[PDB]
Structure 1
Amino acid sequence: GNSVSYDGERRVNFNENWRFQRETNGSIAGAQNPGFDDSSWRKLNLPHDWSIELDFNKNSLATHEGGYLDGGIGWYRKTFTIPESMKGKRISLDFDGVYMNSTTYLNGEVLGTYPFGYNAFSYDISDKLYKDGRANVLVVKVNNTQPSSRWYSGSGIYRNVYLTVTDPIHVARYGTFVTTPNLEKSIKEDRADVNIKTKISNDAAEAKQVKIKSTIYDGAGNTVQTVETEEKTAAAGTVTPFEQNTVIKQPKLWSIDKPYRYNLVTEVIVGGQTVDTYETKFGVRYFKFDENEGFSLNGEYMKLHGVSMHHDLGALGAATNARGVERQMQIMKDMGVNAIRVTHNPASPELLEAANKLGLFIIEEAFDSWAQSKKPYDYGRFFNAWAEHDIKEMVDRGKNEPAIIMWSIGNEIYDTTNAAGVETARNLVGWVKEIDTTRPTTIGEDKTRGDKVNVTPINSYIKEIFNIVDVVGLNYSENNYDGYHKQNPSWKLYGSETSSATRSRGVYTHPYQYNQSTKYADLQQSSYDNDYVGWGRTAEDAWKYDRDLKHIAGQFIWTGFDYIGEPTPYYNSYPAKSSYFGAVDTAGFPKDIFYYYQSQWKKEPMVHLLPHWNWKEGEKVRVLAYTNASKVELVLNGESLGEKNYDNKQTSWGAPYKETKDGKTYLEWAVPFKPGKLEAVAKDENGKVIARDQVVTAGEPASVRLTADRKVVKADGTDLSFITADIVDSKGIVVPDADHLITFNVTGQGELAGVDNGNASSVERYKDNKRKAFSGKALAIVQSSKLSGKITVHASVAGLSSDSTSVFTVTPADHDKKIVAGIDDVNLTVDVNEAPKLPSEIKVYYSDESAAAKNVTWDEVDPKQYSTVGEFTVEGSVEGTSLKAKAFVIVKGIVAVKPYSTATKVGVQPVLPEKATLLYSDGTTKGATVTWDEIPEDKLAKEGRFTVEGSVEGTDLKANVYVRVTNEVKSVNIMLQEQGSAYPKLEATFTNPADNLQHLNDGIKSYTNNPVNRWTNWTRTPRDAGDSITVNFGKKHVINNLDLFVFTDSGTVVPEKAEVQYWDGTAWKDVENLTQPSPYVVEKNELTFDAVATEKLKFHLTPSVKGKFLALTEAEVYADQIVMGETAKLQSITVNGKALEGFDHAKKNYELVLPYGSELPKIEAAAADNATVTILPAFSYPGTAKLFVTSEDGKVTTEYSIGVSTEEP
């Protein structure tokens, strides 16, 4: 417990060296008081969401709404001492957020409790601390009992915690409310009237004479206007308010395209000396919601192009981070967004700061539910006692923000149709108006949706509430946008939520069918914009509804950014864990609808040709072009494919917009696919080109290239850098369907904060060093530490080339000065006897996140370096500074023949890859075409092993492969017809005579009124034990599935499960790859068990309902075969043809130390009866080679490792 670092700053950070322990074996007692022994607990930096670190639990009580991530009860502790500089002055402990039902103790005594989860709270700490210099013990209990939210919320102290140190006479917690009343009339005279109301708290023992000097500082730091009030008495232990009026000449208005802000420094002066200073940043802006003309900031009309964000930050969970929030706000700004509607909870301070800096409006929303709770442990349980406090808290914190434009009171609240609902809405609006009368109140109501076609007749109480609030928001109720305006001309309307469409990144299924709330077998959603929820609409529908009406202030499309939890279409699928709504996935990679909204809402020209170009030959593919230009023509491999265009239309009041004759806002073709390059050139009205975009067919995966958004970051310990790892083709084209496992290694002055790929149906933990790519991309987040320097990230995919990227970390002081931070390294890969190339200029990065190419002088490269296979470094010098450049060259290629092996059946050639992997003795894994020798059927028939020769095209050497044989030959088809046989004679444990078992393979299903053909074990007595069906074949062929068609009636019910077993002539065994879908009634089914020796296949059934019987109509099995054999474990292992010293079956690794500089050794291995063995000879000086063995048909396996090494030089 190190003492708090205090340097006179008013607010002291408090995130350092906390402790944590989550309850797992019941309540842990004694954790409240200082006497607890917490030396065994884990240490962590405070902004911390403990739920994201846990792995996904299928049985979590937060089922499919919290994302299957557990919360629970967690304990925090911190031991600290207060320096002697802080003695004798007021100290308060400020939390920006603890998720729910928090109870904080200090020195063993209860300090308070704050049920709400998204609001800051504070406690007065000065009296409780120990002034003896001994150690204090702050303890925070967090009780996030599970079913407490409709979306992933996180758990624990997920926002910053501060200490506020101030003189006994100080500005109050939020004791400053600077406003600019009547700005619209004033600005015409080029003058803003500023009114400042500051509240001074006097916690001293006696009244004192208090004076205030308030000065307005410009954006650049030069004084604008300073005013000093008149001294007035300040009674002890009370808040005494002041008030001042000033002016600003030629004020710089805060605006979306120019977010200027001022800075007010309030100095409290007692006895002719400053005693306390307070800083609040405000802005000079005025907005209006007109019932006919819509929203308008200052004098300019504009639409509220908005998105409905959540607080979850994706890979790093609910834990707040300034850079991550700013990054997602920058992406949303890049989409053309004007406003953010913080969904169903107040905003974090970082979000408001990012909105104020970037220039985005904000709509703060206080509650998701009033006293009528939506989940058992939701906040409605606490609403009656804490609603006033929480709404006042939100309005007080946010009153000074220029970004905020409205206060929302609720969203889809079930008791809004009752008299108590009107009463509590009136209460809430009154409480909001008690602090901030300069912004309208708002409510989000969905019950007006009705049939979604005609103007719903509004409920009486809903009308009352709509009359109480200043602005009315309509969720998914586009059918009332103009009806309610006509019926109620005084209402100001906007779309609080619209177009709840679903979409996965890079998924293009069902191109021409528009579905509603449909699940799919792959647990994905179509990115063609043909998928949306039942109550929602396609993005185009909502945008067209909003665009046509002047009086609609705008809309806020749903979810903006994907978030964890609420995979609506998949209401109970387990792998489905994250939303599909967002226009940008969880990792921050835009989907196609991102570019649709870019075309619709932005002004500058562009074009996006969405579907990737990796399809099968000759199949027509629907290609769309989300563009705002008036013309587009496709040029497939140089041949123009035709030109499509818009019509320059206009709305009723004269707002230009572009649309086709059909009424579609996007251009569309239907092209037959052929590999190559597909290019779209966007041409304006006169034909001038104004934008371009292309999609080119990708090749086989080649490497893993890393891109870093910000190459220079601060060394403040929290600045993040986001690294885009995407599998690429040899030409540098992202493979559109790659899903390889990327392994990240981060070393230097930083650490891996998290990884993600944006997949909504993956249960890969976010806090790990590896992540599967999804649609050819994956994300890695690295956060800097307190030490300046460099962060080096290394990514590697098995069978692919690696890549390394550098992130330079500089001190905060240097970030404001233009000095060199570092020079990026160069990575090159060449073949043997290939001279590597060195660029004439390379990029040098300064401390101000800027800078570009600079001249360099490279040192000589000798022929010896690249004339042989190996790895070496090349160094140079840049002309700008003394720092040494560096280039890494990898020289690898044809060294030795590559080994391969396979197994197959008798008379069937093995499944040999038509693209051989050229894994020479260097570590490189290039791929190339191979023409295998025609394997005679005579050799396949003969038992044993044989070698085959593979002719690789364009290589200096030829490949080889080994083979194994089994059973008998077969054709591709399953079966045409059986003339007659004893095989189809089925058997079962029990079969009613009237329900002959043979019907299950007769082929005629009897779902409908057609003649009954079924098996049924019906009896007069219960048969809850179950029954099994048996089939037999004499074949020697492949199997891939087990079909099940079920029969049901008053007596017979569907099986609870279908366990499948196989008979090999000796005993029964379990099959692999069952994959039994979920239960059903009168529906078809299939189990996907893999090919297995199935002399007899028997699967057992049990009733789904006790006291009810079992029945079936058809079950399909096809073939049979025999196992390879009872092969034993490894037999021999040798290195360089010599026995490996230290080898032992009871040792994990075998170490060999050759003389320094010796050639890498070669490895050979074998197993009993030629059991399959994976052989990987060593290729690199460091590391250790590994081998694996496969035997028999069960779990028998073993790993053999050979630690090649050498002695000292």
Structure 2
Amino acid sequence: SVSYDGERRVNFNENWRFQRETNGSIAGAQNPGFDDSSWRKLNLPHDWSIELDFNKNSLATHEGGYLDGGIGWYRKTFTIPESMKGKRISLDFDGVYMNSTTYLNGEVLGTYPFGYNAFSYDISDKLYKDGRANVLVVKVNNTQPSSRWYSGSGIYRNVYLTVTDPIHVARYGTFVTTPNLEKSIKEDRADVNIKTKISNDAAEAKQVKIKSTIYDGAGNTVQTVETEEKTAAAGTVTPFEQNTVIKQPKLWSIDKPYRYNLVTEVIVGGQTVDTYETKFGVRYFKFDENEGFSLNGEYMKLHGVSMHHDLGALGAATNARGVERQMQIMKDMGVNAIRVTHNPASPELLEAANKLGLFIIEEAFDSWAQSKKPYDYGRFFNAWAEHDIKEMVDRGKNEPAIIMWSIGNEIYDTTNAAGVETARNLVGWVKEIDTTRPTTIGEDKTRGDKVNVTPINSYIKEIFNIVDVVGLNYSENNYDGYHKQNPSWKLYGSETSSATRSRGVYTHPYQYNQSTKYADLQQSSYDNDYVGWGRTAEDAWKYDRDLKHIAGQFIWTGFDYIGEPTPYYNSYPAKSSYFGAVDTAGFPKDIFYYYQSQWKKEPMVHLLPHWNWKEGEKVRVLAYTNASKVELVLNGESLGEKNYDNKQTSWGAPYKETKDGKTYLEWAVPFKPGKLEAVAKDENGKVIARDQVVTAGEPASVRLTADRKVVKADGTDLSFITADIVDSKGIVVPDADHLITFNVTGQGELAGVDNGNASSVERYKDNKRKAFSGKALAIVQSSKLSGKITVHASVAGLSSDSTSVFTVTP
């Protein structure tokens, strides 16, 4: 029996039964009378794939991380209270991967093929009204292979009931805009336009008004605006439109992500019968064909990353804090933009970007009608694409972080006439919902020989003219050239670099290799392993850095993700990616610091590699840094300064680079144990940053560090616990791989473990994990009881350790 205290959306994640087909088809699972009493009980969100052992024979292959999908069944038996009688009730899924069929009381509600959009079924008249039990079933069909990356399987995003009066705001029924904010801002005002759609799902017409109130971030009223009454015919939708104003508006920006909140009151016979909230931001931006990108009139480059949807040891199961953490770590790297590759975002991700200050480019599709994998969305595209792309846009049209809608990635169809037709449609469908943001596409097939300005396929060129902003994948050779040939075009790197690297691995230091495999199943962190179609981080950066018209880039990728262990194809146990600047565990690789050095003002310096080598062996030592110069000191003895030249772009923007082209500093140092220090200075010789690398002793203990010492006792919030293997002096042992055992006590539960090792096939859902390059991770989830969490860790032969996190009733 459902908990209803009058809320408009009810959390419906609890008390499901779940069972995966392992022995062929489960007869009668969709029927109300089926007996599921011995099935596992669990709460959503849930990813069934992540709980399985890695399976070298999985149909997912390396591409999908060697984790099985298949057919999964979810069942919920429930009743509706008296308090909901005569309400409208919709069952609302934020996402299910993939191809689900939903049954209610034996009847099919629907089949939903796409795995990354929200969807909804109205069930108002379909529920039994006596207090007899309803039986809801979701059959999930993730037959493989369906995906070029790890998808997860099941109901991996939240579920809700939406409960309203028969007269209500429609799904996604508000649209808030700020027209001509470019100009209106000059007189310190924002003109706010508000379009509201009201459904009448009652028997008879009714007289309806809308009261619209804007609050600021503190809760203060800013405007109130009420309409005339209006006839709302039964069984229809009736539109309302209002204009108002905000004086000295606080703008949403990357640095100051401010939002307002619109409360919409639907009023019938002097009674407010429905209430709907719309969080929104006030901001304007522009892609300019010569000057690149700006936000609120401020020129900036898009320092972007691409991100897949999994959250590491959590699998696909979404989590507000989980994504938020990913986004904070990207902010620390200097990132201001996210390409959500290659499918819509969870609500949680959107919210993270809205709250922390990140642009979003949201992409609908990884294929159109021509499949990349046999069970992907290609087979559904002609029937469903209009629906699915409109769902994306309609869902997100008020979100200030979102700045661009991408109609596809690396789409085969773009080299023929059918694909040009399809692009026209898609762009049209977008614009039926939202014309305030540019459309785009990510395109790889103009890459050519990576050197000459590739003559453009004529169909691709038609399509670049159909979208508003042109995204190039791996095609730096065309950045300037296509700009000169097509002066009206706006261009950016929609996907770049795809350099490959393992955390703490320092191999073949003086060779730059392409798509090359090693016996260790790792890749080097000297920015010297990258795929044949790509580039070093540095090289991809320079192309962008040097051109004003290039709006920016989106590297492949910000975070590692499960699957696509390129260049190790078909080499179990390589199962997860090497592309990320940060590993699946949230631990930065050295290249994170390189991006800082290029993208942030705060002075820093970062050395690599570690300082555990053989005596006399000559070590390639690098400093990533935005200082003018660095002095390197080994055991108190100077090894010399190295410096950048001050350079400028062709438009006069300064940047740092050596006489020989390097965007970092380098020494070659014969190894002597001790302490290697870097002293970063400005031109005047003044010290502005430091970093150290220190030879570690024998492993002595494990050491725990929690990322936050207080979290919410809401059953979903998370604490991330770093476990380091250290020597007796607290230095991390840089190549340590000791098995660590974790135990959680108090008001929380272990939710997963990880070390970012791409060629580990250790369980994520377990309570033990080896360190990798000295580090592992434990993720803990709070319960609904406030109190305190204690995490204990131990390693054979070393001292144990403990740390604590308080949890608080929100």
Name the TM tier (shorter chain): over 0.9
Cα distance between partner residues in 2 of 1:788 and 1:313: 25
In the TM superposition, what is the alpha-carbon distance from 1:720 to its structure 2 partner? Answer: 0.6
Cα distance between partner residues in 2 of 1:228 and 1:658: 56
In the TM superposition, what is the alpha-carbon distance from 1:656 to its structure 2 partner? Answer: 1.0
Cα distance between partner residues in 2 of 1:112 and 1:417: 35
1:1203 maps to: none
In the TM superposition, what is the alpha-carbon distance from 1:144 to its structure 2 partner? Answer: 0.2
- Please state whether the residue corresponding to 2:378 is helix, strand or coil: helix
1:563 maps to: 561
1:1030-1050: CA deviation from partner (whole Å, max 9, x where unpaired): xxxxxxxxxxxxxxxxxxxxx
Cα distance between partner residues in 1 of 2:56 and 2:118: 33
Matches within 5 A, 1:753-902: 753-812=751-810
In the TM superposition, what is the alpha-carbon distance from 1:377 to its structure 2 partner? Answer: 0.3
Cα distance between partner residues in 1 of 2:59 and 2:161: 36
Correspondent of 1:479 among 477, 480, 487: 477
In the TM superposition, what is the alpha-carbon distance from 1:34 to its structure 2 partner? Answer: 1.1
- Please state whether the residue corresponding to 2:329 is helix, strand or coil: helix
- Please state whether the residue corresponding to 2:217 is helix, strand or coil: coil
2:66 maps to: 68
Cα distance between partner residues in 2 of 1:805 and 1:4: 38
1:967 maps to: none
- Please state whether the residue corresponding to 2:433 is helix, strand or coil: coil
Cα distance between partner residues in 2 of 1:148 and 1:706: 39
Cα distance between partner residues in 1 of 2:25 and 2:87: 37
In the TM superposition, what is the alpha-carbon distance from 1:807 to its structure 2 partner? Answer: 1.3
1:584-613: CA deviation from partner (whole Å, max 9, x where unpaired): 001000000000001100011000002000
Correspondent of 1:352 among 350, 353, 364: 350
In the TM superposition, what is the alpha-carbon distance from 1:415 to its structure 2 partner? Answer: 1.3
1:541-580: CA deviation from partner (whole Å, max 9, x where unpaired): 0110000000000010102100000011111111100010
Cα distance between partner residues in 2 of 1:45 and 1:598: 39
Cα distance between partner residues in 1 of 2:284 and 2:549: 19
1:700-719: CA deviation from partner (whole Å, max 9, x where unpaired): 00000100001111010000
Structure 2 unaligned residues grouped into runs of 5+: none
1:68-100: CA deviation from partner (whole Å, max 9, x where unpaired): 000000000011111111111101000000101
- Please state whether the residue corresponding to 2:371 is helix, strand or coil: coil
In the TM superposition, what is the alpha-carbon distance from 1:22 to its structure 2 partner? Answer: 0.3
In the TM superposition, what is the alpha-carbon distance from 1:790 to its structure 2 partner? Answer: 1.1
1:690 maps to: 688
Identity %: 100
In the TM superposition, what is the alpha-carbon distance from 1:17 to its structure 2 partner? Answer: 1.2
Does residue 5 (structure 1) correspond to residue 3 (structure 2)? The answer is yes
In the TM superposition, what is the alpha-carbon distance from 1:345 to its structure 2 partner? Answer: 0.3
1:1113-1169: CA deviation from partner (whole Å, max 9, x where unpaired): xxxxxxxxxxxxxxxxxxxxxxxxxxxxxxxxxxxxxxxxxxxxxxxxxxxxxxxxx
TM-score, with length taken from structure 1:
0.67
- Please state whether the residue corresponding to 2:108 is helix, strand or coil: strand
1:466 maps to: 464
1:734 maps to: 732
In the TM superposition, what is the alpha-carbon distance from 1:135 to its structure 2 partner? Answer: 1.1
Cα distance between partner residues in 2 of 1:341 and 1:449: 20
1:135-159: CA deviation from partner (whole Å, max 9, x where unpaired): 1111100000010000000000000
1:543 maps to: 541
Cα distance between partner residues in 2 of 1:687 and 1:9: 62
In the TM superposition, what is the alpha-carbon distance from 1:687 to its structure 2 partner? Answer: 1.2
Cα distance between partner residues in 1 of 2:457 and 2:112: 36
Cα distance between partner residues in 2 of 1:421 and 1:31: 41
Give the ranges of 4+ consecutive aligned residues of structure 1 lying more than 4 Å apart after TM superposition. none
- Please state whether the residue corresponding to 1:281 is helix, strand or coil: strand
- The alignment of Structure 1 onto Structure 2 pairs a total of residues equal to 810
Cα distance between partner residues in 2 of 1:415 and 1:90: 42
Cα distance between partner residues in 2 of 1:46 and 1:555: 35
Cα distance between partner residues in 1 of 2:559 and 2:453: 31
In our comparison, the structure showing a higher alpha carbon Rg is 1
In the TM superposition, what is the alpha-carbon distance from 1:368 to its structure 2 partner? Answer: 0.2
Cα distance between partner residues in 2 of 1:459 and 1:527: 36
1:739-765: CA deviation from partner (whole Å, max 9, x where unpaired): 000011112211100000000001001
1:508 maps to: 506
- Please state whether the residue corresponding to 1:501 is helix, strand or coil: coil
- Please state whether the residue corresponding to 1:604 is helix, strand or coil: coil
In the TM superposition, what is the alpha-carbon distance from 1:505 to its structure 2 partner? Answer: 0.2
1:1039-1081: CA deviation from partner (whole Å, max 9, x where unpaired): xxxxxxxxxxxxxxxxxxxxxxxxxxxxxxxxxxxxxxxxxxx
1:146 maps to: 144
2:645 maps to: 647
1:130 maps to: 128
Correspondent of 2:597 among 589, 596, 599: 599
In the TM superposition, what is the alpha-carbon distance from 1:791 to its structure 2 partner? Answer: 1.1
- Please state whether the residue corresponding to 2:805 is helix, strand or coil: strand
Cα distance between partner residues in 2 of 1:415 and 1:260: 40
Cα distance between partner residues in 1 of 2:261 and 2:546: 40
- Please state whether the residue corresponding to 1:188 is helix, strand or coil: helix
Cα distance between partner residues in 2 of 1:220 and 1:656: 40
1:301-335: CA deviation from partner (whole Å, max 9, x where unpaired): 00000000110100110000000000000000110
Cα distance between partner residues in 2 of 1:710 and 1:82: 39
In the TM superposition, what is the alpha-carbon distance from 1:806 to its structure 2 partner? Answer: 1.1
1:91-134: CA deviation from partner (whole Å, max 9, x where unpaired): 10000001011000011110111100000000001101111011
Cα distance between partner residues in 2 of 1:486 and 1:748: 64
Cα distance between partner residues in 2 of 1:94 and 1:353: 18
In the TM superposition, what is the alpha-carbon distance from 1:722 to its structure 2 partner? Answer: 0.4
1:991 maps to: none
In the TM superposition, what is the alpha-carbon distance from 1:789 to its structure 2 partner? Answer: 1.1
TM-score, with length taken from structure 2:
1.00
Cα distance between partner residues in 1 of 2:663 and 2:774: 29
In the TM superposition, what is the alpha-carbon distance from 1:337 to its structure 2 partner? Answer: 0.4
Cα distance between partner residues in 1 of 2:714 and 2:775: 29
Cα distance between partner residues in 1 of 2:635 and 2:237: 75
1:298 maps to: 296
2:39 maps to: 41
In the TM superposition, what is the alpha-carbon distance from 1:292 to its structure 2 partner? Answer: 0.5
Cα distance between partner residues in 2 of 1:556 and 1:32: 44
In the TM superposition, what is the alpha-carbon distance from 1:537 to its structure 2 partner? Answer: 0.2
Cα distance between partner residues in 2 of 1:327 and 1:610: 25
Cα distance between partner residues in 2 of 1:344 and 1:193: 34
Cα distance between partner residues in 2 of 1:488 and 1:193: 34
In the TM superposition, what is the alpha-carbon distance from 1:293 to its structure 2 partner? Answer: 0.6
Cα distance between partner residues in 2 of 1:314 and 1:186: 44
- Please state whether the residue corresponding to 1:85 is helix, strand or coil: helix
- Please state whether the residue corresponding to 1:778 is helix, strand or coil: strand
1:1074-1127: CA deviation from partner (whole Å, max 9, x where unpaired): xxxxxxxxxxxxxxxxxxxxxxxxxxxxxxxxxxxxxxxxxxxxxxxxxxxxxx
Does residue 110 (structure 1) correspond to residue 76 (structure 2)? The answer is no
In the TM superposition, what is the alpha-carbon distance from 1:283 to its structure 2 partner? Answer: 0.9
Cα distance between partner residues in 1 of 2:98 and 2:635: 59
Structure 1 unaligned residues grouped into runs of 5+: 813-1209
In the TM superposition, what is the alpha-carbon distance from 1:614 to its structure 2 partner? Answer: 0.2
Cα distance between partner residues in 2 of 1:436 and 1:240: 19
Cα distance between partner residues in 1 of 2:608 and 2:84: 60
1:388-419: CA deviation from partner (whole Å, max 9, x where unpaired): 00000000001000000000001111111101
- Please state whether the residue corresponding to 1:133 is helix, strand or coil: coil
1:663-708: CA deviation from partner (whole Å, max 9, x where unpaired): 1000000011100000101111111111110001000000001000
Cα distance between partner residues in 1 of 2:772 and 2:443: 37
Cα distance between partner residues in 1 of 2:608 and 2:276: 51
1:165-220: CA deviation from partner (whole Å, max 9, x where unpaired): 00000000011001001111100000000000000000010000000000100110
2:54 maps to: 56
- Please state whether the residue corresponding to 1:434 is helix, strand or coil: helix
In the TM superposition, what is the alpha-carbon distance from 1:276 to its structure 2 partner? Answer: 0.5
Cα distance between partner residues in 1 of 2:750 and 2:411: 41
In the TM superposition, what is the alpha-carbon distance from 1:635 to its structure 2 partner? Answer: 1.0
2:393 maps to: 395
Cα distance between partner residues in 2 of 1:713 and 1:257: 25
- Please state whether the residue corresponding to 2:752 is helix, strand or coil: strand
Cα distance between partner residues in 2 of 1:675 and 1:69: 43
Cα distance between partner residues in 1 of 2:507 and 2:351: 40
In the TM superposition, what is the alpha-carbon distance from 1:463 to its structure 2 partner? Answer: 0.7
Cα distance between partner residues in 2 of 1:332 and 1:672: 35
